Design an enzyme around this catalytic site. Structure first.
Site, mmCIF file in Angstrom:
data_model
loop_
_atom_site.group_PDB
_atom_site.id
_atom_site.type_symbol
_atom_site.label_atom_id
_atom_site.label_comp_id
_atom_site.label_asym_id
_atom_site.label_seq_id
_atom_site.Cartn_x
_atom_site.Cartn_y
_atom_site.Cartn_z
ATOM 1 N N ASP B 9 39.403 48.764 36.607
ATOM 2 C CA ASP B 9 38.147 49.214 37.212
ATOM 3 C C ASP B 9 38.439 49.899 38.542
ATOM 4 O OD1 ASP B 9 38.962 46.787 38.404
ATOM 5 O OD2 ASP B 9 36.917 46.176 38.891
ATOM 6 N N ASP B 14 44.079 48.747 41.474
ATOM 7 C CA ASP B 14 44.172 49.246 40.109
ATOM 8 C C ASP B 14 45.044 50.503 40.085
ATOM 9 O OD1 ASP B 14 41.740 47.717 38.452
ATOM 10 O OD2 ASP B 14 41.228 48.106 40.569
ATOM 11 N N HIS B 237 46.749 43.196 44.370
ATOM 12 C CA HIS B 237 46.618 42.122 43.380
ATOM 13 C C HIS B 237 47.038 42.567 41.975
ATOM 14 C CE1 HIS B 237 44.028 39.949 46.331
ATOM 15 N NE2 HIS B 237 43.489 41.138 46.542
#
Ligand SMILES: [Ca+2]
Ligand SMILES: [Ca+2]
Ligand SMILES: [Ca+2]
Ligand SMILES: [Ca+2]
Lengths: 302, 309, 295, 311
Positions: B9, B14, B237
């Site tokens: 997303d 990302d 992350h």
């Protein structure tokens, strides 16, 4: 100078260590001990508490409270709940007044300077709060052993005292009274090692023998290397709060049935934007703490 | 090479994940699927296409679910900004999404495969859950799922919940009850990947299109991650999932029984992880505990330098 | 004519719905979509195809969701015992029912009504997969729920209980809703004299009706067909506008339709809830549809 | 006949007052004591209300104050139905009596424990006193002959679509009672709504006269408006008095045995009594649930009791 307290507990091996410290240290004025069901049923925790006071010659009244949580199907932990030390036949008895009424009466007649120290399930505390909500402003502080901001013990989500009566905990944590929470995150650090025990054995006397007898049985110290004393940290906190680091947080108790029933949800990072309602224990100075335990032990030496 | 479908997303981290996945010789990036999350799907789609266009990544991109399966939609614009990828400025978009819906692409690719593809979800799990319930025959065809999501300790969006799970708890419940091998890169691990200014300067030193984009992107999340969660750098992350597939020895995991709480209330979207095994249930997830950040940043530089022309 | 897409999980009384929908001149049956419910999808699909083949209904049939969107699957118990079918030669279309629902609505002029008479899984997925369908749906007339006592549990009617999260999606969609709940449908009790009447009418549809209802006596209700009745003539059915909420709490009310009968929440109504049906009118309509199949 | 001994637990409360009136007078009932709980209004007010009723009717029964709050939830009141005082309508002379010094929970415990197991509890407010007594001394459970309570609904609630006020006011307390194992009778809304006290009914009791007749009229005229405006009712049902009726002659009320569970989930069914009407769960019944009442019988009984107070 002395902090007046009512110690509410479910003895319980480590409740016994809390009683021992509370009844002896000159910084604490132990007014009464109130018993609740928890570690075992009330018949047993009452006998356990009376046994400790008799052996240590603690002349403080002991009151029996709630034998069941306020709503849930009762759970216990895990023969007496305090094997290890040798007790003589019990000659001491509970007072006739129910613990809830004693808590209500004592707070109502007080000058608002009494602190409640719950180290079992919160059933007595919650029933007293809802039976006479006029006690709320009379309570100076509540310093309780319970909860966990991280992992629990009895479930992944919940610490035993909270899990035993989640609805009672919800009452306490929504009371608006100043709260201090000695949760598993802190208490699991206060590790009793063979050296700690040896140290108390050397000090000796009734308090030293009791501590040792409890922890030698509990930690199986002929063998492999220690474990925690949870409830007594509350007493430590009242004697010198500088020994324990806390962080103010907004804490909510989850009473949903399912995988987080009885969880203490602690807003560590403050993302909910709600005012903090609890001083949550983070770290303890174990050198300071064990020194304090030995000190209390020595106070019983004739 | 591990074959993967990267579901995301985008999203600042990302984008770092895409960059690594598309370049490292140990990964075969089959396709990218886009879901609503950090922003609405219109925006996360554009963001994903923009990254691929700038890095000249020639992988098909599919648009998936614009909403979660049941709850009212939430976005993470407080972290990732209004566009969902503030910081870099891109050229006008020439490339477009494929006509096939991401859920159908996921289903068809798994069903026609030899069972060797891994799914790598680093957004909400909506696409994954819908594909799983629309064609349950995909379950034995999935080798593994390595996801960024959850936390065994403190969440971010709430005290209980990590954003990806919180954005679609019912979808997460489907995945975590699927019986497929799961790896969970939760906050407890991923927060250790804080990208500080010296780390950014490292990648600028490397240079090329991927170093410049790394800098443009992560300079933005410095302020946001600090103001929102008190972090010393924007963790990265989602890229830890790619790291895990390249060399799992860089990351320490612990097997646990994990349950997703779908109760409305203070633990909605929490990943409840049985760290100590008190429930006596078989583990269903490899939960990330620690990451070797020396190894990990080396790997990021390796991938960045792949784009130097 | 009202254009409809009939979404169903055949199912004995789904079959009666198909029969009415496919024949009455007031209804334009565009397609039938199948969902898991009464039985697993493999079976409900076969059941639906079997009904269309026997009645010679030339409407495309699409296979949809074999599972609910989140919960552990439940069935009620072939899932359509009673009539004997020949070997099955009719097949499903290749397009998944969710995609067919999305595409047909998006390309429409907003005049199509959805008629779900099974769990709401296909409807919920189509709504979340392409939220642009929402303003394109004229109305949704569904069989499901109960304002009073449920069937599968005290709290919940089967269709809702089979996928509560899906139902939550539909009931929070904002689209005009009509709910034919158990409170209404349980009144539509077929008696041996209603059966005998459809038998006298005769033909394939009359034989089918008789075989299905001589069975599930072992009178009893025809639930799903009331939705088709409502579209043919809504004056036959009394409704009451209510604010309805679907409870997705695990526990004793999971999948309950909570209906604010007395308006004590002060929220705007979102659902026309069925209260009573004129059974004389309804059985006349069933007989009428039966006769549509005589050659 | 043999008198049924009862403890009436209530939150007066308009129909509570009608309940007290019937209980205190009918020869088939032995009213041992009245216990007061917070509900319709705060406890300070429901206590005053109860004392006022007893004083005016010259009922010489001890009254005990109990729980001022529910056991866990955030307190709610029913001032919408019962007015600001909790018993708007009648006038009352200054109080010359007072609550007993013993808390209602302790009184309930002590009386049951010292009894021969033949006392019935009659709760017609929230269940807070009953739940706290049960958990404080579980030994009272086998001492309780039966509990005949006004509360719940198998169909539509009042305060919410799902919940009846007494249960909604303390759902956790209700869960305790409904999982107690004691014989339960539930006079829920489905039955009690059939007891709408229209103007002709009030005029009938005014015709009967005397202190209970005048008080009946003064009390029930107030809920006429409030019950209409809130709930669309043609008269103020007299809910709580049906419990007394049930004890005087159960043949006047039809019940059905059901397995009943209280929902304590936060959300749209918090405080709902979930009743397994058709027995689909296969669990043993734990409650006799009220279905229909013979209103001819019931109003005759009310008049009988009213006429009892004529001097
Ligand atoms: Ca303890
Ligand atoms: Ca992401
Ligand atoms: Ca059906
Ligand atoms: Ca009342």
């Amino acid at each position: 100078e002395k902090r007046k307290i009512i110690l509410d507990c479910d003895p319980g091996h480590d409740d016994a260590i809390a009683i021992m410290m509370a009844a002896k240290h000159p910084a604490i004025d132990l007014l009464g001990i109130t018993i609740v069901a928890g570690n075992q049923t009330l018949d047993k925790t009452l006998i356990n508490g009376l046994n400790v006071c008799q052996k240590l010659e603690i002349n403080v009244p002991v009151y029996a409270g709630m034998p069941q949580p306020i709503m849930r199907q009762q759970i216990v932990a895990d023969d007496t709940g305090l094997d290890g030390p040798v007790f003589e036949p019990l000659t001491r008895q509970a007072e006739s007044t129910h613990a809830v009424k004693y808590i209500i009466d004592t707070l109502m007649a007080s000058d608002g300077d009494i602190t409640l120290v719950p180290v079992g399930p919160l059933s007595n505390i919650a029933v007293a709060m809802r039976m006479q909500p006029a006690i709320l402003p009379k309570i100076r502080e509540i310093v309780l052993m319970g909860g966990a901001y991280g992992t629990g013990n009895f479930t992944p989500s919940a610490e035993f005292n909270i899990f035993a009566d989640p609805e009672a905990a919800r009452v306490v944590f929504t009371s608006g009274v100043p709260l201090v929470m000695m949760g598993l995150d802190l208490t699991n650090q206060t590790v009793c090692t063979p050296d700690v025990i040896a140290r108390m054995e050397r000090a000796g006397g009734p308090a030293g023998e009791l501590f040792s007898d409890i922890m030698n049985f509990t930690l199986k110290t002929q063998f492999e290397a220690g474990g925690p004393v949870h409830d007594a940290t509350c007493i430590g906190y009242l004697i010198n709060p500088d020994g324990i680091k806390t962080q103010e947080m907004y804490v909510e108790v989850d009473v949903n049935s399912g995988p987080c029933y009885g969880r203490t949800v602690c807003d560590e990072l403050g993302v909910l934007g709600k005012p903090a309602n609890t001083k949550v224990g983070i770290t303890i100075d174990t050198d300071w703490f064990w020194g304090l335990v030995e000190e209390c032990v020595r106070g019983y030496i004739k």
